[PDB]
Write a protein that binds this ligand. Sequence first.
Ligand SMILES: CCCCCCc1cccc(NC(=O)[C@H](N)CCP(=O)(O)O)c1
Ligand SMILES: *[C@@H]1O[C@H](CO)[C@@H](O)[C@H](O)[C@H]1NC(C)=O
Length: 442
Amino acid sequence: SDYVNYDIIVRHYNYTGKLNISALTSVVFILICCFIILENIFVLLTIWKTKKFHRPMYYFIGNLALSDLLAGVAYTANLLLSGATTYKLTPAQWFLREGSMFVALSASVFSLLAIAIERYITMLKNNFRLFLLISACWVISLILGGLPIMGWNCISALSSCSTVLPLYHKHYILFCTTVFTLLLLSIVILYCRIYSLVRTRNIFEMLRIDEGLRLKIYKDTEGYYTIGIGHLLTKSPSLNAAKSELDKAIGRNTNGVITKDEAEKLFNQDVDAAVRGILRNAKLKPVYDSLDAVRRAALINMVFQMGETGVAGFTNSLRMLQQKRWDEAAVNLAKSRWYNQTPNRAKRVITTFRTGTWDAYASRSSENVALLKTVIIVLSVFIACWAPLFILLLLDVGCKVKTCDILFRAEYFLVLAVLNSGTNPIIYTLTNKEMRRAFIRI
Ligand SMILES: CCCCCCc1cccc(NC(=O)[C@H](N)CCP(=O)(O)O)c1
Ligand SMILES: *[C@@H]1O[C@H](CO)[C@@H](O)[C@H](O)[C@H]1NC(C)=O
C-alpha cells in the first residue's frame, strides 16, 4: 500500500515511544490562538487604515503579522489534529499538519531580516520591488517547509526519525535549526551595527548644522582659518599657513580642497578630542556619565565650540544637569553669554537638553529612534521564545530513540514559540506609542 496510509503514523509514534504514553487543555489554547488571530488582524488593519503607515518598513511589519496570523491558524488546526486525532491522519496530512508551522516560521524569520535591512537604509539613503520581496519570502518559505512533503523525511529510516517530530528526518531539523539561528545571529549583529553607527551619524548631522560643513578653507567670525565641520587649522592670518596644516592633517596636497570622507574623518578627531576633554574633567565626566546618548552628544556640541574650561564655566548649569532638572539648566544657559554669541546655534543645543530628542535638528529622528528600540525588542522576544525549542531540537538531532527524556515532553517549548506570535501586536502599543495612537484611533 501507498506510503500515504495510517499505519506509518502508528509505526513512527511507536519507535519514538509516544504511542502508549498518552494523557481539556487544548480548547483553552484553541481560544488563545483566536486572540492571536485578532491581535495580528488589527496590526494588518491599522497599517491599511493609516496614511503615515503606508511606509516601506510597515509593509514588512505587516507581513510578519501575516506570518504569525497564519501561525495562529496552522496551530488551531494542529490542536484539532493532535493527540488522539494524530492517528486519524495520513503521512501526507501529517507532513501538511506540521509543514504549515515551518512555513509560518520561515516567513517570520525573513520578515525580521526585511525589517532589520529596512533600518540600515534609513541612514544610508522602491514600492513595486517590495511586494516582490514579500512574494519571494513566501516562495522561499514554502520550498523550505515543503522539503519533507517533497521527500526529505524518514518514512523508511526509523533510526533517523526525530523524537519530537516522528516523521521528520534529524538531518532536516539539523538544517532548519542551523539556517534560522545563523539568520537570527546575522540580524542581532545588524541591529548593533545600525544602533552604534546612527549614534555617530546623529553627532555628524548635529554639528553639520551648528558648525557648518566646508570643503574649501574659509575664515571664522573671529578671523582664524577653518575647514569642514568647524576644524580650526591655525590662528595665523596666513592662508598658506592654514594650507600647511590642512595638507599635513589629511596628508595629500589638498590646496584647500578636501573630500566628503576627508572632512568626516577629520571631524571624528575633533569629536574624540571633545569626548576626551569631558573624560579628563571632574565637572564634565559625572555630567556625561549621567546624561543619555542624545544629551551626551548635546554636551559634546558645547565642548566642540568653547572647550573643557569654556563649558566648565557653566557649573551653575552643569549642577542642574546632574540633578536632572533640565528646565532650570535651559534657562540659566539662555541668560549666559554663550546663548548670546551664537544664538540660533545654542537655541538648538538648549532645545536638545530640554527635550532629550533630535526634534530640533531633523524632524524624523525621534519616531525613527522609537521604532529602532521597539523593532529590536520584537526580535529580542522572538529569539527568547524559539531558542528553548531550537536547543531541544538540536538535542534530539544528537539523541538516540527513548534515551533523552526531555524530548517526550517538548510541548512546553512548542507552545512558548506559538504564544510568541501574540507578543508582537502587544509590544507595539506599549513601547512605540506612535503606533498605539493609530490603533486606539480605530
Ligand atoms: C527548526 C524549525 C522549528 C519549527 C517548529 C515547528 C512547530 C512549532 C510549534 C508547534 C509545532 N507542532 C507541534 O507542536 C506538534 N503538535 C508536535 C507534537 P506531536 O506531533 O503530537 O508529537 C511545530
Ligand atoms: C511497535 O508496537 C508493537 C505493539 O503495538 C510491537 O510489535 C513493537 O514492540 C513496536 N516496535 C518497535 C520498533 O519497537
